[PDB]
Protein backbone atom coordinates (compact mmCIF):
# COMPACT_ATOMS: atom_id res chain seq x y z
CA UNK A 1 0.00 0.00 0.00
CA UNK A 2 0.71 3.81 -0.56
CA UNK A 3 2.13 5.44 2.36
CA UNK A 4 3.89 3.18 4.79
CA UNK A 5 3.83 4.18 8.57
CA UNK A 6 6.45 6.62 9.55
CA UNK A 7 8.12 5.63 12.67
CA UNK A 8 5.48 8.18 14.84
CA UNK A 9 2.52 6.44 13.09
CA UNK A 10 3.13 3.04 14.60
CA UNK A 11 2.63 4.28 18.15
CA UNK A 12 -0.22 2.65 19.83
CA UNK A 13 -2.70 5.39 20.65
CA UNK A 14 -5.54 6.33 17.90
CA UNK A 15 -4.11 9.92 16.80
CA UNK A 16 -3.96 12.36 13.76
CA UNK A 17 -1.93 14.94 12.88
CA UNK A 18 -3.27 18.15 11.06
CA UNK A 19 -1.53 21.06 8.80
CA UNK A 20 -3.45 24.23 9.73
CA UNK A 21 -1.51 25.94 7.26
CA UNK A 22 -2.34 23.68 4.40
CA UNK A 23 -6.24 24.36 3.23
CA UNK A 24 -9.21 22.79 5.22
CA UNK A 25 -6.43 22.02 7.64
CA UNK A 26 -5.89 18.33 6.23
CA UNK A 27 -4.58 14.90 7.90
CA UNK A 28 -0.93 14.66 7.08
CA UNK A 29 0.01 11.64 9.71
CA UNK A 30 -2.73 8.81 10.67
CA UNK A 31 -1.58 6.45 13.03
CA UNK A 32 -2.03 2.41 12.47
CA UNK A 33 -4.18 1.91 15.13
CA UNK A 34 -6.41 4.93 13.90
CA UNK A 35 -6.79 3.23 10.86
CA UNK A 36 -8.06 -0.09 11.76
CA UNK A 37 -10.16 1.80 14.16
CA UNK A 38 -11.65 3.94 11.29
CA UNK A 39 -11.34 1.12 8.79
CA UNK A 40 -9.25 3.45 5.94
CA UNK A 41 -6.27 3.02 4.12
CA UNK A 42 -4.08 5.75 4.65
CA UNK A 43 -3.66 6.74 1.22
CA UNK A 44 -7.41 7.45 1.48
CA UNK A 45 -7.08 9.39 4.44
CA UNK A 46 -4.48 11.86 4.28
CA UNK A 47 -4.94 15.15 2.62
CA UNK A 48 -8.68 15.30 3.83
CA UNK A 49 -9.83 17.10 7.14
CA UNK A 50 -11.47 14.26 9.45
CA UNK A 51 -15.04 15.69 9.05
CA UNK A 52 -15.62 11.94 7.24
CA UNK A 53 -15.75 10.66 10.27
CA UNK A 54 -18.83 12.33 11.44
CA UNK A 55 -22.32 10.80 10.43
CA UNK A 56 -26.12 10.93 11.18
CA UNK A 57 -25.94 10.14 14.88
CA UNK A 58 -22.83 12.59 15.09
CA UNK A 59 -24.30 14.96 17.49
CA UNK A 60 -23.52 18.56 16.01
CA UNK A 61 -23.52 20.83 18.94
CA UNK A 62 -20.20 18.70 19.81
CA UNK A 63 -18.81 19.07 15.98
CA UNK A 64 -19.20 22.81 17.08
CA UNK A 65 -17.31 22.58 20.07
CA UNK A 66 -14.30 21.19 18.32
CA UNK A 67 -14.71 23.63 15.19
CA UNK A 68 -14.60 26.40 18.32
CA UNK A 69 -11.37 25.26 19.54
CA UNK A 70 -10.03 25.29 15.91
CA UNK A 71 -10.69 28.68 15.14
CA UNK A 72 -9.56 30.10 18.99
CA UNK A 73 -6.07 27.71 18.62
CA UNK A 74 -7.03 25.71 21.92
CA UNK A 75 -7.52 22.75 23.09
CA UNK A 76 -11.02 20.71 23.67
CA UNK A 77 -11.92 17.26 25.13
CA UNK A 78 -15.69 15.92 23.80
CA UNK A 79 -17.13 12.91 23.43
CA UNK A 80 -19.29 11.83 20.23
CA UNK A 81 -20.14 9.40 18.12
CA UNK A 82 -18.24 8.93 15.29
CA UNK A 83 -18.36 6.50 12.01
CA UNK A 84 -15.99 3.83 10.60
CA UNK A 85 -15.30 3.23 6.74
CA UNK A 86 -18.10 0.47 6.79
CA UNK A 87 -20.59 2.59 8.90
CA UNK A 88 -19.75 0.89 12.48
CA UNK A 89 -20.51 3.55 15.40
CA UNK A 90 -17.87 4.30 17.80
CA UNK A 91 -18.02 6.76 21.02
CA UNK A 92 -14.89 8.97 20.76
CA UNK A 93 -13.66 10.47 23.67
CA UNK A 94 -12.28 13.00 21.85
CA UNK A 95 -9.04 15.58 22.81
CA UNK A 96 -7.79 18.19 20.22
CA UNK A 97 -4.85 20.53 20.87
CA UNK A 98 -2.46 22.83 19.06
CA UNK A 99 1.57 21.87 18.49
CA UNK A 100 3.39 25.37 18.50
CA UNK A 101 6.63 25.67 17.46
CA UNK A 102 9.54 27.25 18.51
CA UNK A 103 8.05 30.66 17.85
CA UNK A 104 4.77 29.55 19.84
CA UNK A 105 2.83 29.38 16.22
CA UNK A 106 0.66 26.83 15.70
CA UNK A 107 2.20 24.81 13.30
CA UNK A 108 -0.07 21.40 13.74
CA UNK A 109 -3.09 20.14 15.62
CA UNK A 110 -3.00 16.61 16.64
CA UNK A 111 -6.35 14.63 17.50
CA UNK A 112 -6.26 11.59 19.68
CA UNK A 113 -9.06 9.55 19.98
CA UNK A 114 -10.32 6.74 22.87
CA UNK A 115 -13.12 4.53 21.10
CA UNK A 116 -15.61 3.18 23.48
CA UNK A 117 -19.03 1.14 23.57
CA UNK A 118 -20.76 4.27 25.49
CA UNK A 119 -20.32 7.48 26.41
CA UNK A 120 -18.33 7.56 29.85
CA UNK A 121 -18.97 9.61 32.98
CA UNK A 122 -16.86 9.94 36.44
CA UNK A 123 -13.80 7.35 36.59
CA UNK A 124 -13.72 6.21 32.94
CA UNK A 125 -14.06 9.77 32.09
CA UNK A 126 -11.36 10.89 34.58
CA UNK A 127 -9.09 7.76 33.60
CA UNK A 128 -10.05 8.46 29.38
CA UNK A 129 -8.95 11.87 29.75
CA UNK A 130 -5.80 11.42 31.76
CA UNK A 131 -4.97 8.97 29.16
CA UNK A 132 -5.85 11.18 25.69
CA UNK A 133 -4.13 14.14 27.67
CA UNK A 134 -0.70 12.61 28.28
CA UNK A 135 -0.61 11.07 24.84
CA UNK A 136 -1.25 14.52 23.40
CA UNK A 137 1.42 15.55 25.70
CA UNK A 138 3.44 12.80 24.16
CA UNK A 139 2.99 13.62 20.39
CA UNK A 140 3.58 17.08 21.42
CA UNK A 141 7.29 15.43 22.03
CA UNK A 142 7.40 13.18 18.60
CA UNK A 143 5.94 15.81 16.30
CA UNK A 144 7.89 18.61 17.31
CA UNK A 145 10.80 18.56 15.51
CA UNK A 146 8.79 16.64 12.09
C1 LIG B 1 -6.43 17.23 14.55
C2 LIG B 1 -7.90 17.10 14.30
C3 LIG B 1 -8.55 15.91 14.55
C4 LIG B 1 -9.93 15.77 14.38
N1 LIG B 1 -10.53 14.59 14.74
C5 LIG B 1 -11.85 14.50 14.66
C6 LIG B 1 -12.49 13.28 15.11
O1 LIG B 1 -11.91 12.38 15.66
N2 LIG B 1 -13.86 13.28 14.96
C7 LIG B 1 -14.60 14.31 14.39
O2 LIG B 1 -15.81 14.15 14.27
N3 LIG B 1 -14.00 15.45 13.99
C8 LIG B 1 -12.69 15.54 14.13
N4 LIG B 1 -12.07 16.72 13.77
C9 LIG B 1 -12.92 17.88 13.46
C10 LIG B 1 -13.18 18.13 11.99
O3 LIG B 1 -11.99 17.92 11.25
C11 LIG B 1 -13.70 19.54 11.79
O4 LIG B 1 -12.81 20.45 12.40
C12 LIG B 1 -15.11 19.77 12.32
O5 LIG B 1 -16.01 18.93 11.61
C13 LIG B 1 -15.55 21.22 12.25
O6 LIG B 1 -15.33 21.84 10.98
P1 LIG B 1 -16.43 21.82 9.82
O7 LIG B 1 -17.66 22.52 10.34
O8 LIG B 1 -15.78 22.58 8.70
O9 LIG B 1 -16.70 20.38 9.49
C14 LIG B 1 -10.68 16.86 13.89
C15 LIG B 1 -10.00 18.05 13.57
C16 LIG B 1 -8.65 18.17 13.76
C17 LIG B 1 -7.97 19.47 13.40
MG1 LIG C 1 -10.86 17.95 3.10
MG1 LIG D 1 -12.37 24.44 24.03
Known amino acids: GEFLATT ?5 KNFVITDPRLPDNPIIFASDSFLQLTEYSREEILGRNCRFLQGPETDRATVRKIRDAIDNQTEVTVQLINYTKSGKKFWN ?4 QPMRDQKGD ?41
Open 8 to 12: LERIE
Open 93 to 96: LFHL
Open 106 to 146: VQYFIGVLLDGTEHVRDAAEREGVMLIKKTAENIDEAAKEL
